[PDB]
Amino acid sequence: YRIEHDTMGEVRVPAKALWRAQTQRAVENFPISGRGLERTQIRALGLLKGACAQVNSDLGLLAPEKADAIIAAAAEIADGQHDDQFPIDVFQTGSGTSSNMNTNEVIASIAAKGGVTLHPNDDVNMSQSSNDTFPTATHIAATEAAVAHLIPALQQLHDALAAKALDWHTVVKSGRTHLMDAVPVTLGQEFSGYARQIEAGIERVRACLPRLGELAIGGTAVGTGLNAPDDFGVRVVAVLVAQTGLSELRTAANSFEAQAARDGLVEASGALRTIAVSLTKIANDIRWMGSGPLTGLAEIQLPDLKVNPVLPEAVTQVAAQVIGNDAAIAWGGANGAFELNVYIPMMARNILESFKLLTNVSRLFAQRCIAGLTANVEHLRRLAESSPSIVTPLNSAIGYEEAAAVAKQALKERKTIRQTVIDRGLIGDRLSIEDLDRRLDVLAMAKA
Amino acid sequence: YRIEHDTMGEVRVPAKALWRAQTQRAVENFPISGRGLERTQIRALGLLKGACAQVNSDLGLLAPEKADAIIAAAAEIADGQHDDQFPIDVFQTGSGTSSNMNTNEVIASIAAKGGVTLHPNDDVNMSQSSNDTFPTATHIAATEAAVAHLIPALQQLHDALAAKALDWHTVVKSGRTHLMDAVPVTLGQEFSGYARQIEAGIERVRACLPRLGELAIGGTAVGTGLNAPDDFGVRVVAVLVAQTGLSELRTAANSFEAQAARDGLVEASGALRTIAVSLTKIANDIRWMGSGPLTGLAEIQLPDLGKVNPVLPEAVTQVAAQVIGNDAAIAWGGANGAFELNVYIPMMARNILESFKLLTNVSRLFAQRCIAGLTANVEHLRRLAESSPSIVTPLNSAIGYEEAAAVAKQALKERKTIRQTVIDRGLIGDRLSIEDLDRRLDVLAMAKAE
Amino acid sequence: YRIEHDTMGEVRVPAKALWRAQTQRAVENFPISGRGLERTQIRALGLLKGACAQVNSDLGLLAPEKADAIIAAAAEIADGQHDDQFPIDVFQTGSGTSSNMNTNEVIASIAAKGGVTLHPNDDVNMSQSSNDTFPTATHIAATEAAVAHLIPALQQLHDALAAKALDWHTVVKSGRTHLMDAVPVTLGQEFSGYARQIEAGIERVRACLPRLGELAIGGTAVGTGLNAPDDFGVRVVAVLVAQTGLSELRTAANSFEAQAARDGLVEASGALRTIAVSLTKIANDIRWMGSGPLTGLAEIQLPDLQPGSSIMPGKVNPVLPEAVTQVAAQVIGNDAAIAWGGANGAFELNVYIPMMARNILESFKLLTNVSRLFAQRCIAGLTANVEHLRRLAESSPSIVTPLNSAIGYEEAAAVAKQALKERKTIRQTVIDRGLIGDRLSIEDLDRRLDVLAMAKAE
Amino acid sequence: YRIEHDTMGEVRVPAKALWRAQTQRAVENFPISGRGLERTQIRALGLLKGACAQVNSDLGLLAPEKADAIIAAAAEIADGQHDDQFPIDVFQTGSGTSSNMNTNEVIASIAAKGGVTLHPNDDVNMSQSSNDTFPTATHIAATEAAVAHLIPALQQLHDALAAKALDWHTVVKSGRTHLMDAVPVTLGQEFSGYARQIEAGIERVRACLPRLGELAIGGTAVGTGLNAPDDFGVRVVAVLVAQTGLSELRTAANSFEAQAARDGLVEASGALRTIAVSLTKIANDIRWMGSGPLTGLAEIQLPDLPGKVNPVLPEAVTQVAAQVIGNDAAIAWGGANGAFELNVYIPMMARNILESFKLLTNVSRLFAQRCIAGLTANVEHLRRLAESSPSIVTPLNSAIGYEEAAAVAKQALKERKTIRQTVIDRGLIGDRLSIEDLDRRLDVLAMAKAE
Ligand SMILES: COc1ccc(S(=O)(=O)Nc2ccccc2)cc1NC(=O)Cc1n[nH]c(=O)c2ccccc12
Numbered sequence A: 001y002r003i004e005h006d007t008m009g010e011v012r013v014p015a016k017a018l019w020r021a022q023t024q025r026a027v028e029n030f031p032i033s034g035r036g037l038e039r040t041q042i043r044a045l046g047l048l049k050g051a052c053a054q055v056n057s058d059l060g061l062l063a064p065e066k067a068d069a070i071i072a073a074a075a076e077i078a079d080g081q082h083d084d085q086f087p088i089d090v091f092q093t094g095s096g097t098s099s100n101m102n103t104n105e106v107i108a109s110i111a112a113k114g115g116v117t118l119h120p121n122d123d124v125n126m127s128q129s130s131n132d133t134f135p136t137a138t139h140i141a142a143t144e145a146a147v148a149h150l151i152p153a154l155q156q157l158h159d160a161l162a163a164k165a166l167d168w169h170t171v172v173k174s175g176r177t178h179l180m181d182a183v184p185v186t187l188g189q190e191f192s193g194y195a196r197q198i199e200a201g202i203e204r205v206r207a208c209l210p211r212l213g214e215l216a217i218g219g220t221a222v223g224t225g226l227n228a229p230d231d232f233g234v235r236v237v238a239v240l241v242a243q244t245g246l247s248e249l250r251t252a253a254n255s256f257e258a259q260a261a262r263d264g265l266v267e268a269s270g271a272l273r274t275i276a277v278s279l280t281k282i283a284n285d286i287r288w289m290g291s292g293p294l295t296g297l298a299e300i301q302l303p304d305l306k307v308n309p310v311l312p313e314a315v316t317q318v319a320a321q322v323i324g325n326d327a328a329i330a331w332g333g334a335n336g337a338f339e340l341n342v343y344i345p346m347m348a349r350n351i352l353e354s355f356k357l358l359t360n361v362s363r364l365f366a367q368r369c370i371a372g373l374t375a376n377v378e379h380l381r382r383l384a385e386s387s388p389s390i391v392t393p394l395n396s397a398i399g400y401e402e403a404a405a406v407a408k409q410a411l412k413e414r415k416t417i418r419q420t421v422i423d424r425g426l427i428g429d430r431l432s433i434e435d436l437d438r439r440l441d442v443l444a445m446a447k448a
Numbered sequence B: 001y002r003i004e005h006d007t008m009g010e011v012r013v014p015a016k017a018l019w020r021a022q023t024q025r026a027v028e029n030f031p032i033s034g035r036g037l038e039r040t041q042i043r044a045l046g047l048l049k050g051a052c053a054q055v056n057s058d059l060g061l062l063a064p065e066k067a068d069a070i071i072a073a074a075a076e077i078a079d080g081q082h083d084d085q086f087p088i089d090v091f092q093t094g095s096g097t098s099s100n101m102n103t104n105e106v107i108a109s110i111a112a113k114g115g116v117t118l119h120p121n122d123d124v125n126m127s128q129s130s131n132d133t134f135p136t137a138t139h140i141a142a143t144e145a146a147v148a149h150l151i152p153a154l155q156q157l158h159d160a161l162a163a164k165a166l167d168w169h170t171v172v173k174s175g176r177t178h179l180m181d182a183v184p185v186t187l188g189q190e191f192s193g194y195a196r197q198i199e200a201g202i203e204r205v206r207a208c209l210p211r212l213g214e215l216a217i218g219g220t221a222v223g224t225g226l227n228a229p230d231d232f233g234v235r236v237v238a239v240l241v242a243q244t245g246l247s248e249l250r251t252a253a254n255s256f257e258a259q260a261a262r263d264g265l266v267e268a269s270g271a272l273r274t275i276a277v278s279l280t281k282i283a284n285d286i287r288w289m290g291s292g293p294l295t296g297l298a299e300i301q302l303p304d305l306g307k308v309n310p311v312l313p314e315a316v317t318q319v320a321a322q323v324i325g326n327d328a329a330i331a332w333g334g335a336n337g338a339f340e341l342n343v344y345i346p347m348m349a350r351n352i353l354e355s356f357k358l359l360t361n362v363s364r365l366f367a368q369r370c371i372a373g374l375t376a377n378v379e380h381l382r383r384l385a386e387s388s389p390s391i392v393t394p395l396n397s398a399i400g401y402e403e404a405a406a407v408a409k410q411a412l413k414e415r416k417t418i419r420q421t422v423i424d425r426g427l428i429g430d431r432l433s434i435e436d437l438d439r440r441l442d443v444l445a446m447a448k449a450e
Numbered sequence C: 001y002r003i004e005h006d007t008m009g010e011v012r013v014p015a016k017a018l019w020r021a022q023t024q025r026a027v028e029n030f031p032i033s034g035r036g037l038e039r040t041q042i043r044a045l046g047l048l049k050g051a052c053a054q055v056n057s058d059l060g061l062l063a064p065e066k067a068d069a070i071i072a073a074a075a076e077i078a079d080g081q082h083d084d085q086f087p088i089d090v091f092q093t094g095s096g097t098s099s100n101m102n103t104n105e106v107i108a109s110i111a112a113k114g115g116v117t118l119h120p121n122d123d124v125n126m127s128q129s130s131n132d133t134f135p136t137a138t139h140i141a142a143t144e145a146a147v148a149h150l151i152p153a154l155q156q157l158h159d160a161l162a163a164k165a166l167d168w169h170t171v172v173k174s175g176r177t178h179l180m181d182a183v184p185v186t187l188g189q190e191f192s193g194y195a196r197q198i199e200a201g202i203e204r205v206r207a208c209l210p211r212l213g214e215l216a217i218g219g220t221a222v223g224t225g226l227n228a229p230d231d232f233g234v235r236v237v238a239v240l241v242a243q244t245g246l247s248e249l250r251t252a253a254n255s256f257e258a259q260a261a262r263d264g265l266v267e268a269s270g271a272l273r274t275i276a277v278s279l280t281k282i283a284n285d286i287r288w289m290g291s292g293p294l295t296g297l298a299e300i301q302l303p304d305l306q307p308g309s310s311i312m313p314g315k316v317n318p319v320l321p322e323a324v325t326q327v328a329a330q331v332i333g334n335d336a337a338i339a340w341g342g343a344n345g346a347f348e349l350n351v352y353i354p355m356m357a358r359n360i361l362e363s364f365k366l367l368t369n370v371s372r373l374f375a376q377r378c379i380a381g382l383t384a385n386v387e388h389l390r391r392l393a394e395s396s397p398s399i400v401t402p403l404n405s406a407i408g409y410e411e412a413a414a415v416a417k418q419a420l421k422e423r424k425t426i427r428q429t430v431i432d433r434g435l436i437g438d439r440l441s442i443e444d445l446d447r448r449l450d451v452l453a454m455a456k457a458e
Numbered sequence D: 001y002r003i004e005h006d007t008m009g010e011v012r013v014p015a016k017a018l019w020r021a022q023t024q025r026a027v028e029n030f031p032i033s034g035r036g037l038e039r040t041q042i043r044a045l046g047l048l049k050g051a052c053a054q055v056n057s058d059l060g061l062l063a064p065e066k067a068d069a070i071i072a073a074a075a076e077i078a079d080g081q082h083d084d085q086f087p088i089d090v091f092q093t094g095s096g097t098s099s100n101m102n103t104n105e106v107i108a109s110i111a112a113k114g115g116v117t118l119h120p121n122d123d124v125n126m127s128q129s130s131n132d133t134f135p136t137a138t139h140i141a142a143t144e145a146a147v148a149h150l151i152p153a154l155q156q157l158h159d160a161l162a163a164k165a166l167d168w169h170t171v172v173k174s175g176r177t178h179l180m181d182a183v184p185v186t187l188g189q190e191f192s193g194y195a196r197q198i199e200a201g202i203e204r205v206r207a208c209l210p211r212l213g214e215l216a217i218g219g220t221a222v223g224t225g226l227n228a229p230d231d232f233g234v235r236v237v238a239v240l241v242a243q244t245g246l247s248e249l250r251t252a253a254n255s256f257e258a259q260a261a262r263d264g265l266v267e268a269s270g271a272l273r274t275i276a277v278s279l280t281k282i283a284n285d286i287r288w289m290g291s292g293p294l295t296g297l298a299e300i301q302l303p304d305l306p307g308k309v310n311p312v313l314p315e316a317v318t319q320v321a322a323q324v325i326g327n328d329a330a331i332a333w334g335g336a337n338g339a340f341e342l343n344v345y346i347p348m349m350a351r352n353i354l355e356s357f358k359l360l361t362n363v364s365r366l367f368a369q370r371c372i373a374g375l376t377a378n379v380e381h382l383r384r385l386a387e388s389s390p391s392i393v394t395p396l397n398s399a400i401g402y403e404e405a406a407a408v409a410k411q412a413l414k415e416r417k418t419i420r421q422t423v424i425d426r427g428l429i430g431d432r433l434s435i436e437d438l439d440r441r442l443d444v445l446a447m448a449k450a451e
């Protein structure tokens, strides 16, 4: 319970806390959700402060002693060593200034322990404002989440689906359109469709990266770069690209757009929301396929964790959450004013969560559900042999006219094509039973 | 780092964990969000397990010794003492069966420490299913949140807005329509409008309670009540009402509707979404009125936490955006039940209970640390009202609409009152006395306050 | 074509048009959607202008010959005779002032055809403003759509579901939880669930009416009532209630709230959104129960409404559940547009009214129409596959539980294993393991495996 | 009325109408919205039927005389002569079967007048299904709306915003963060931000075209191509690309994904929703800049439809944005709820995405031409406020100290004077700094970092 002195009086602070007065005031002002920044957001604030210190030292604006202490303190934060020194609520000042100052004060305290004295604002916040720092750390975290985590998780899910598409290439079954019996398909063809949806998901995430990776750093309070070196932005980005290996990080095309709006987060959420839509279709088909056994479709067996489809349920619930988060993101994105969008902490929480939920559930779905699915091959064939048939494959044998007559009589008397051919006395020199059965073969009808 | 034996192998459980093998499997199956049940949900699960034990004892189905240990353990859970014993992800099996089992296991381990042996399923889950318990806890938590926390928080914000509306009864200013100057209003009138929005919010929450407080308990696996006593639902609800004082808790009107759907959460979220919409309008007007101190509207000053950033309005508008997002996720889950069970309950419960908590906490902060301390630029607001082209219309009948337009244009260009412009243009005479001018340009009378 | 003169020049207007210069400007300014007001909004603007003329006449402000001509013209509009005289886009000035002036101009042109001169603004707009009128007409139209059309349509669907619940009271089947086999229910119990969802939907509409029915009329430009009589609102409301029988219409509790916000439309849309969520569950379950007929669940048969496919000549599709689910999607989209408009008012006026009004009134219309069609052309004609349903329930592992106290849970689980393996009934499997004798008669078995008693029907 | 028939039996039809039995059943089955297919959707169905008949002719599967009658009738449909012959509700069977059959029956009725007998299903629907035609028509209409209409409308809005950015390059004013006064910017810089948002919008639409332009045609009932030639898809797409000039049209990457899902409509709606979000920011800022003329910001004047104009075009833009956000939620809901071989939400998803394209196209051109192009800046006023703001005293701190900087800012606001004239009036010239140093430190245009 130490006490610190702030322009407006006394501030008691826990003794093991590396944060100082400004952070403690923010803890007292925003008791709203009881949840603070995630590890990914803390890491990104650490990376940004170390890179800013590096560029300020390289330009001779910051004494190398101070730069070295900030860089060492920043590397600790970026490595997860201080994820308990960020107690400010998500629902804070809309610039994220409070979390920016939290990072400054924690760095000042880490450096004081190694014998170096830093001013949180004058030293740790040199060449930065309260308004270009938090959106930069947000876009670093979002870009890392897309590139290093989500894309590889979706590729894992793609690869599991594609492996089933190949394994089940000739597992014939009935098609269903409008939930009603349709012509044959293979379980492989269905899984090739699921695989494409996740591949298109990766294409969607890749397509947003040119704008998701844009950083505001260098634009300072209003986007003009006042009180920062002219090249601060390009220099800081180059340090971040070198340290993270994230080639997608880049200076904003327009320094005003990069602070007045967070449109890059709205765009990216759209890709995540499309993936949630894709995953809902895949998960719903899979739990329906596994339904029953007696009262359902009983086409496949899901691995057990009468098995409940618990991972399709976790996938569909994650999809619901990404759709809600996406609505919250767009609402904050639309409501900027003049030189600043002041919904950054809320937008950051929601997009980083959507990235995390999709990454974690996709790897789980891939490994613990898709990879272990077993097909009820004999049951599926019996469903295919109960699908409607067509007369087209008899044309070359009985002619367009007779085929048309078979098709009409089958519909009138509610008989199969096969039985109708037999009942009309059509077996003979122009069509053996062998030919009939080859022409109407359900696997051939699936065109696999 | 202690070890337990499962039907499906072995599992290492932390030494100080009161959960057992089923919870630890759920921890291993669902590493998705890293976020578990909130305090309100955990409290509701404790309340429900206590009341179920009370009823099983009352009906002679459960030994009093075992009922007493469950009731004592469930009370500790309801009192918030075991919030770290629920590690299962929100994104679990859609019935919330995993969190149900988590409660049964924690109660058995609390009881063991006091010398009593409880089977988690056979004793703590007696008469209950994996499917009627979690939604009952959700509706308990949501009803308690609405009645005990959100309604009083909204009443505090209403009363703060109403107190400003009375203090500012005669604080005349320019109306604004389409953002353009318009005939006069008072700050008091505008704040009476904000107050009504918040009073209507309370009416909206009160109106959803007949369906939000419906509990599924007693419907067991599919709604039929198979393997429960016929009157289990009405008995457990009566214990819950006797213990909590929450008279809004009631057995569901239709036991199949209460498990096949969560329409009551969708309904309640719509009320919270309407409150978010209202708060967005109030917070946006307040940060605009405080804008400046030179190039903005500079109507009022917000208290610091007139160059103060509007941080509480920013907190309010961010919360409202979250409530809007949460509302979309709840409706999506709501729509997608199948046959006898809606399997989106954990996700729905997280979103509804968060929306209640954020709105409760931000409403009290907004009332106390923003509204209560606003200060109006009274003389400034009146001088702008008295200098507005919008107020020349009552001059038409004395000087004609052509000269009234000329007065408006000169007052604006010269930055003078309409009064001083009429005098300066030599219009005082038989067609218009100084007294008649002051009657026609009485901006407070134009506002028609009481 | 026929020329006119605005203050900003000369405007050409179609010959057959009762609108004038201001409406023709608004036609040229907002070529955005190609869609104008719906007949329900036009009707309400006519009801409102007639009530206003009647009150202005009663208070001695408007000459009786002018009041009578506005009243007669406004009755023609409210009766649907002039639905083609409102060409202005939905996406107009956010107060709806363009559509208000369209109404004033069309009433003046009707009065002129009978030899009476009305000034669109000073006569037809007397005691009104460009800001209290369009929201009043919107709330009249939404209240009418709720009370006269949606609630009776939902009652018709409730009554159809409830009749099925009663007809199928003894139609036993397996429950499904997580899409997996569960203990028995009846088709009647499931339909009683659907009925309750629609009855609750009616309760939700009724609960929003105290605020949906609030009218801004009398508040004029900013909510102060400047340039209107002090009691204009209570007088216009009294006439509207007497004429329409819509008892839910009332003057707003707070005149500022009623113009600064449209919270009553956001509230009502939430009720419509909840009905869309209920209808999605009901329609989804019904198409699943009708699925197949050979590769799906085949629990019920839906009445045939049209051919499904030319490739597959005899295939018939659940077209009404598809129409219901698509309507529900549109209602959830419209709901999001309404909340967005509702949040973004400023100071004395919300300027999203035309867009909010389009979305709320369309949600009312789609839910009313699709509910009636779903009740009459789908629910009413459903048939149950009773013998199929009972066969699965009598073969369910889930029904062995009541054998426990006779043969013990380990032997019950073996009966389940075997039944499910040998495709037998539980009853037959119990016989085929010789368990009938001392601790279990054949009558005692038939009593424990009574699947309808397991469903516990009232 | 006259009598017709289908597989289900006999139906009365308006004696006059060019549709037949299946269309009339659908008119009776679906009186829900009272709105039918839009011009763009009818056009797409006619283009597709003509292309299918051309390929069927080229593969010798359909007699030349029949293919010609279809191609001629389909040209009349695509050119917009027969729109009153499409009476079927949007809210129809979720495959759009009903509107497919409507196109087939109308084509057959047209060819009959010309004395040619076509079977709606056997000839006009040859090598086709319900399930592959309506989504193909939908993706043609959406691709055409993106490439030929929305991108050029956004480019016109970009150019108008960029022209303002250049004209207003030195129009210095107060920055605003949190709605509070901040260090200087120029109107030109703010408008360069708005231009970037719209340029980024065009980039978002272009990025979605590789999947928006994927066509289902050739997959028939379930995705397998049963009952069509193996290359029906590649041949029909080549005819569509040659007839429209839309090179973005392409065969589906996966024939099952292209019918089981409409994920390309969801993706495209995400781009449109983001544009709605950008236009909301741009329009809100412009109507605030024009607020007044006495009690608001009074930074600019919007053109009339001088100082007292209502911001009617910003109101239309923000109302259109609200509708695109609503439409977007409906499209995603439909997108998620496919089952097995078919998504049956196509007519509703098509209504919403094509409406969003249309609203954004039309409101963007109006905004550009009738609001942006005619804005006038209060140039001298904006500079005087910027020169009078407590925000610009900071560069004096090093000369006069924090305490005196604060006393200068306070007096400047109270006396409504410039910072320059408050520093002089306080007698601070001489000791602390010269007039040269004061004019260097308080140059508001240099502070905005503009030339
Ligand atoms: C946020 O609006 C203001 C903020 C501060 C001040 S002040 O106290 O500092 N005084 C002042 C006077 C002249 C120049 C600068 C400042 C005045 C204003 N408004 C105005 O000057 C309003 C105004 N009046 N008359 C005009 O013909 C006019 C023309 C264009 C734009 C606005 C107007």
Ligand SMILES: COc1ccc(S(=O)(=O)Nc2ccccc2)cc1NC(=O)Cc1n[nH]c(=O)c2ccccc12
Residues within 6 Å of the ligand: B293, B294, B296, B297, B298, B299, B377, B380, B383, B384, B387, B415, D294, D295, D296, D297, D413, D414, D415, D416
């Ligand atoms: C929309 O803001 C304005 C609109 C019009 C005008 S004007 O051109 O018509 N001039 C004028 C001057 C005084 C009163 C009325 C008019 C000035 C203003 N702003 C201000 O007066 C800003 C301002 N400056 N200094 C203060 O100490 C102060 C105190 C409280 C609030 C604001 C301020």
